[PDB]
Amino acid sequence: GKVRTKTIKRAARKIVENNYESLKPKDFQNNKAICSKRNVAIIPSKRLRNKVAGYVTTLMNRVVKGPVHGISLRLQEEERERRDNYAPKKSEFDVENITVSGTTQQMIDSIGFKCMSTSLK
Amino acid sequence: MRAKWAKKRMRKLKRKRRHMKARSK
Amino acid sequence: QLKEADVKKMLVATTHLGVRNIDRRMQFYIFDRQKDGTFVFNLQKVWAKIVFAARILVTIDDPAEIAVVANRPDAQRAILKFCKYTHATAFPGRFIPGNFTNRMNPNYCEPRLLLVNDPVVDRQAILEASYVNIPTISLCNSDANLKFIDVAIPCNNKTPMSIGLIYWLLAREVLRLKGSISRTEEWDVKPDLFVAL
Amino acid sequence: PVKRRNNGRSKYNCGHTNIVRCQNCHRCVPKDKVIKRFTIRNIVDNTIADDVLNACVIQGFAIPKLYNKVQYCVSCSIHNHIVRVRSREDRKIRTPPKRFPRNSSQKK
Amino acid sequence: EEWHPSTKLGRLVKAGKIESLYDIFKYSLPIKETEIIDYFFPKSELAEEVCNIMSVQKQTTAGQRTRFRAHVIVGNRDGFIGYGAGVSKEVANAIKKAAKNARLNIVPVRRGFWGGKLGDPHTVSSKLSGKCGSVRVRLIPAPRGAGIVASPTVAKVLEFAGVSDVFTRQSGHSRTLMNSVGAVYNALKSSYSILTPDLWKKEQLDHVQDIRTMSL
Amino acid sequence: MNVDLLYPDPVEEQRKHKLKRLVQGPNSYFLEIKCAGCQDIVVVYSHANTPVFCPGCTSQISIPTGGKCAFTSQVERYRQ
Amino acid sequence: DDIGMKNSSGVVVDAYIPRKCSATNRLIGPKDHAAVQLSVARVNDKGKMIENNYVTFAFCGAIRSRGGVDSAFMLLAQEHGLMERL
Amino acid sequence: VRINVLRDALKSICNAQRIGKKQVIVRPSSKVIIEFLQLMQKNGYISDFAVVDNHRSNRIVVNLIGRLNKAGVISPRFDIPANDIEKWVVNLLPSRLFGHIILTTSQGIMDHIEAQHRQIGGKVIGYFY
RNA sequence: GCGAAGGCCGGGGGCUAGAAGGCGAUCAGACACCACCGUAUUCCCGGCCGUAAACGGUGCCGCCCCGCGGCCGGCGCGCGCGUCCCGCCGGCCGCCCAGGGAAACCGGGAGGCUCCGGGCUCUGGGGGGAGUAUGGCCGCAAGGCUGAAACUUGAAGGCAUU
RNA sequence: AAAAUGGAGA
């Protein structure tokens, strides 16, 4: 197999997340020409560029398959962070859990409140 | 076990002296 | 003081339990152990403690300067809520060791005060604070190591519903001192958004 | 330069013990310094269990299960790799590794 | 130069908001910048002495990693002192890493007294005992009729502190200087670490000069 | 938490050693027992060393054990 | 009375007065790099508003290590009056 | 066995104060340990004290001001003339500003400062830093 | 006054191992390691010996401690009564907080102590020579117990880092 | 299974 160095993978990592745009997920050919806009990166030799252009096809494939570690998709940063912001059916998380034994009732009896008339329901 | 093979060597030296001290007197 | 609707919230939101093991410094907060054996806490103690925590938070010169470090999965959802209403500069994720000492390190934050998500998952973070002179404030379980912790919040702490109530309670209590979020009224927020599915 | 606090022994409130000899070394060892792994193994080999079970002339027969204690000497244990010398951190780990709750002398 | 303040207290030192080194010491602060300590007193300020550049050669696969390490002792006469040391291959990079370490640790001498307290202090307030590995040292306060009674290396360190007279006793490997000069320094730390009837008081919750609070 | 040694707290004192308490006091009591048949009152130590027989019944009303003394007849509680 | 090292006159010969840690009475050390100054604020009746004045306690890291600074803080707060009947 | 009650009290008080526990217990009350404690309270090192009393040895409960730095005993008592009081101040006292050595004189039991000023020297019961 | 083993002194006993001693087989030697015999011994009784890495390499009796769990001995504690909990514990301990230590590590101490002073027996003073010489004592002997010097010469040693 | 040396002194 082939395993590349940190800088080679990190350049590819920078190229796929910090400038995602639309590098190809499953196709090598667009990736072959989409990594040479000059501003996006400058490195000599086609094969050296091709080393980044190899991992990019797996990294974008990984992002398409699922979120990567520390996923930072430039095109799609607000993805399911809205779900953490989301609340469920009516946000009625509370009410009627109960599950209080006599000692659990004694804990509320120790403070001044006497919850549910000492009859949880 | 050098200590054992020194101590018992010393005892063999001590015994030699006893015969030498008495027989000679 | 205590409010019954919120008090019954803590009871129904897993803030009625702790670890079966106990420590002498958590005995007062603990009501006792019941037949079940998980130590059951005392509710008034929890509310009183959260007000005491609030007064230190208003005291800091920059409300942003407080840092809360969350190193546990459960803590993240509730920790996100702290930043939305309170201004504390969060310190999320694994601590990245030595940040307080390493000013050169990228995420280094000097928090005039500290806040720890779990007593036994921030072991580096309280020692790191001890190096940088930071007053240490934290959350504590029924059994916890209180080493390098000045005051802490009695709680179950091992389920995010309880963790959720704590950040909710603390946020509401500092805001009540600032006289902004409720003032003898309803908190716009609802108990959900304090757990991540 | 004390190597282990236990000193290779579990002797507490004691002064002398009985000696059990190594199955391999034949070296007398006090009960305290002996490995004492207890092993449960089927009397037949697992490979031919099937054909012998196939020859079940008596009804509901089960394999003969043998209960025995293996007690190798310290030197016998290391060379036959019953246990392996470990680092200072590994010294206090009180468990045999490689799980294996499987019931046979060979861990298979 | 024109150093970006590395420390948050560095911004206070840069602003001139820090009043002096004493103020950060009163609020118990860690001083992380050589410039941060220089701001209180810069320009000649402390005299500098360097000794004992031991050459540790660490045996390895081929030739030992010959390297050097030397001890630098701060000497400002105004009741402030420190012990620092540096390890590096080049003679320069070693003493000049040490100079930085003695600067980063500055401790205030008590500057105490015996029988006569009318004039300015001649000795430390209490017997100062410092434990550095094997070396344990003692600095029993001396009357002004007594001089600086000390061993040749340990006297230079206390001359740098500026205490005029002292009574010194020692135990441990006195020949190993790093432990000894470390000990007399770790003893100087004891100078304010002792509760004194004069020190006892109940008040001072002012907090207005919390260095951490103070900001630009 | 306010706990004061000078003024000793009685709740913990009971759990404490008969000697470890701020005052080394007795940890046992005299208990009168009710013979069911007759109303003679017999005082017994909480821990009995020698047997006390209910007057009028030769059989010992208490057979001593290392601590609590059990009674063949019904027990009158402490002093009541 | 010029608390701290003082001259025969009684004025402070040494200005530095390491603040005595409030809780243990023992002083905060010059090198107490683990020193802590917990401060909490007072309240105003029904409003329970913050008045910008906050009582500032101090604690060395040895009490922190003792983990007893929590009970101690509340009792010290009773000394400063913040603690209620509890 | 227990020969010196004051050493078991001194390290009782010093050890307790080291943990920071103001209230401390002492297994036996002694009229001489009363002298050291009340001379400690008089100099202000220790705070209000009390002896819960059984009819036996008695237990001493002492609250502290928390300021005690060091306390200790010289066993057994060694008698020094009032001429040599100052050599013993040098060895067992940190400084002559906070010096106090418990001396015993027939005409009242006082700390070292008052005694030499009174020109009487007896035996050094215990050190008080 | 006891005191493991081995040894010894007379009996009794003798299953196995087995100092000696014999073999074979090893290796340039195999005196040995390893196989195979095998005597003393081992087991018992009546005595002597009186020593061991007899070690926790840490005398004894006290005091004060920082928390978390076991195991054993009682003894209470309430509890739906279950070897249920919770202490009083006396001992067995594990990890360990300060504290201490040249370190290793100890911390139911090896801590409270160069801020060096509960009590009381013992022992040491560079490495050899030397447990030798010489006396005395003990044993039947083996050996024990007590215990120098003449001379040498610059380290011997301790725990740790690569 | 055997398996023994490594002159002195930088």
mmCIF file of C-alpha atoms (C1' of nucleotides) in Angstrom, chain I residues 68-156:
data_model
loop_
_atom_site.group_PDB
_atom_site.id
_atom_site.type_symbol
_atom_site.label_atom_id
_atom_site.label_comp_id
_atom_site.label_asym_id
_atom_site.label_seq_id
_atom_site.Cartn_x
_atom_site.Cartn_y
_atom_site.Cartn_z
ATOM 1 C "C1'" C I 68 -10.467 5.290 50.298
ATOM 2 C "C1'" G I 69 -11.595 -0.334 50.415
ATOM 3 C "C1'" G I 70 -11.188 -5.439 51.662
ATOM 4 C "C1'" C I 71 -10.053 -10.145 55.665
ATOM 5 C "C1'" C I 72 -10.628 -12.160 60.758
ATOM 6 C "C1'" G I 73 -12.403 -11.673 66.293
ATOM 7 C "C1'" G I 74 -16.279 -10.303 69.290
ATOM 8 C "C1'" C I 75 -19.871 -6.325 70.442
ATOM 9 C "C1'" G I 76 -23.753 -3.114 69.860
ATOM 10 C "C1'" C I 77 -27.002 0.119 65.350
ATOM 11 C "C1'" G I 78 -31.618 0.713 63.197
ATOM 12 C "C1'" C I 79 -33.774 -1.551 59.319
ATOM 13 C "C1'" G I 80 -39.361 -5.906 56.533
ATOM 14 C "C1'" C I 81 -35.058 -8.931 59.014
ATOM 15 C "C1'" G I 82 -31.928 -10.167 54.992
ATOM 16 C "C1'" U I 83 -24.429 -13.089 57.632
ATOM 17 C "C1'" C I 84 -29.201 -6.235 55.719
ATOM 18 C "C1'" C I 85 -26.643 -1.955 56.894
ATOM 19 C "C1'" C I 86 -23.879 1.007 60.310
ATOM 20 C "C1'" G I 87 -20.394 2.083 63.826
ATOM 21 C "C1'" C I 88 -17.187 -0.032 68.575
ATOM 22 C "C1'" C I 89 -13.473 -2.132 66.489
ATOM 23 C "C1'" G I 90 -8.596 -5.759 68.691
ATOM 24 C "C1'" G I 91 -5.700 -7.841 65.039
ATOM 25 C "C1'" C I 92 -4.553 -8.844 58.826
ATOM 26 C "C1'" C I 93 -3.696 -5.479 55.110
ATOM 27 C "C1'" G I 94 -3.674 -3.079 50.418
ATOM 28 C "C1'" C I 95 -3.042 1.451 47.758
ATOM 29 C "C1'" C I 96 -1.781 6.176 49.188
ATOM 30 C "C1'" C I 97 -2.718 12.864 51.339
ATOM 31 C "C1'" A I 98 0.507 16.158 53.536
ATOM 32 C "C1'" G I 99 5.243 15.012 56.153
ATOM 33 C "C1'" G I 100 9.847 12.705 55.769
ATOM 34 C "C1'" G I 101 13.965 10.476 53.061
ATOM 35 C "C1'" A I 102 21.051 10.385 49.089
ATOM 36 C "C1'" A I 103 17.509 7.889 46.773
ATOM 37 C "C1'" A I 104 14.636 3.381 46.535
ATOM 38 C "C1'" C I 105 10.615 4.161 48.862
ATOM 39 C "C1'" C I 106 7.582 4.524 53.736
ATOM 40 C "C1'" G I 107 3.233 6.537 55.060
ATOM 41 C "C1'" G I 108 -1.882 0.915 61.341
ATOM 42 C "C1'" G I 109 5.657 4.966 59.492
ATOM 43 C "C1'" A I 110 10.864 4.716 57.729
ATOM 44 C "C1'" G I 111 6.104 10.987 59.589
ATOM 45 C "C1'" G I 112 5.149 14.696 63.537
ATOM 46 C "C1'" C I 113 12.523 16.710 64.007
ATOM 47 C "C1'" U I 114 19.024 21.227 61.728
ATOM 48 C "C1'" C I 115 11.988 24.969 64.106
ATOM 49 C "C1'" C I 116 17.299 18.815 65.801
ATOM 50 C "C1'" G I 117 15.461 16.938 73.737
ATOM 51 C "C1'" G I 118 8.165 10.792 75.684
ATOM 52 C "C1'" G I 119 10.860 6.565 78.306
ATOM 53 C "C1'" C I 120 14.280 2.267 78.080
ATOM 54 C "C1'" U I 121 17.776 -1.884 76.444
ATOM 55 C "C1'" C I 122 21.012 -2.881 72.047
ATOM 56 C "C1'" U I 123 24.421 -1.610 68.038
ATOM 57 C "C1'" G I 124 27.881 1.150 64.683
ATOM 58 C "C1'" G I 125 32.360 4.725 63.466
ATOM 59 C "C1'" G I 126 36.653 4.064 55.799
ATOM 60 C "C1'" G I 127 37.732 -0.545 53.280
ATOM 61 C "C1'" G I 128 41.005 -4.585 54.565
ATOM 62 C "C1'" G I 129 43.836 -7.760 58.526
ATOM 63 C "C1'" A I 130 39.526 -10.513 61.163
ATOM 64 C "C1'" G I 131 35.918 -13.172 63.434
ATOM 65 C "C1'" U I 132 41.964 -13.985 62.719
ATOM 66 C "C1'" A I 133 45.716 -14.163 66.874
ATOM 67 C "C1'" U I 134 45.645 -14.588 72.510
ATOM 68 C "C1'" G I 135 43.278 -15.736 77.189
ATOM 69 C "C1'" G I 136 38.437 -17.222 79.424
ATOM 70 C "C1'" C I 137 33.739 -19.774 78.961
ATOM 71 C "C1'" C I 138 30.721 -23.756 76.549
ATOM 72 C "C1'" G I 139 30.060 -28.393 73.853
ATOM 73 C "C1'" C I 140 31.346 -35.321 73.556
ATOM 74 C "C1'" A I 141 33.040 -33.359 69.134
ATOM 75 C "C1'" A I 142 31.810 -30.286 65.172
ATOM 76 C "C1'" G I 143 31.660 -25.868 66.496
ATOM 77 C "C1'" G I 144 29.542 -21.701 69.596
ATOM 78 C "C1'" C I 145 30.304 -17.320 72.696
ATOM 79 C "C1'" U I 146 33.605 -13.343 73.872
ATOM 80 C "C1'" G I 147 37.447 -10.519 71.084
ATOM 81 C "C1'" A I 148 42.563 -7.096 69.797
ATOM 82 C "C1'" A I 149 46.963 -5.759 67.180
ATOM 83 C "C1'" A I 150 51.398 -5.563 63.696
ATOM 84 C "C1'" C I 151 50.833 -4.084 58.820
ATOM 85 C "C1'" U I 152 48.226 -2.429 54.308
ATOM 86 C "C1'" U I 153 45.924 1.718 51.031
ATOM 87 C "C1'" G I 154 42.241 5.076 48.703
ATOM 88 C "C1'" A I 155 38.583 4.055 48.124
ATOM 89 C "C1'" A I 156 35.069 0.107 49.905
#
